[PDB]
Amino acid sequence: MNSGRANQRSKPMTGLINDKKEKIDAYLPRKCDWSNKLIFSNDQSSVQIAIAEVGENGQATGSKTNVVLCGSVRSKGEAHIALENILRERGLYPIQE
Template identity: 45%
Template structure:
């Protein structure tokens, strides 16, 4: 909620996951908040930082590192050092494995019905 001056006056503003945009609940004990310091061209800390919050759901799926790499690359903190970074292939691999399991089950059930 905002007052007439446009300032936030809520007592509690919940955090949101930077990767999924989900609200991080108070009981989400798997969530983390990571601050990455910004540096100048000489590698010295400028005093500014970029904050990322990751919910327990992303971390439980094993996608925390991929999500953090994708977010840091989007914000210019990480170079695109590989074609794999930032494409979300971890999620695609899991979906591909699920698809392969479905194909094997379908082939098995077809074989059993003969």
């Protein structure tokens, strides 16, 4: 049910904003795309995959898509199924001739 999914990524992520509508959080952390957990400041086993964009002729385009996969999900041997799905979502895993 795409339902809830589309809506959480919906708007931009912005940390602790004060009355003066200022951002304060020293930095805005990466968030695991398949789980929506926070990627640590020292999360050893969490990785950011870089996949490349192709252009209807077998050639490669100077354009890449990234996938953040938190630690645990990568540890439960999810990644392969996790990724293969974040790619369905961003319309890509199914690779037509």
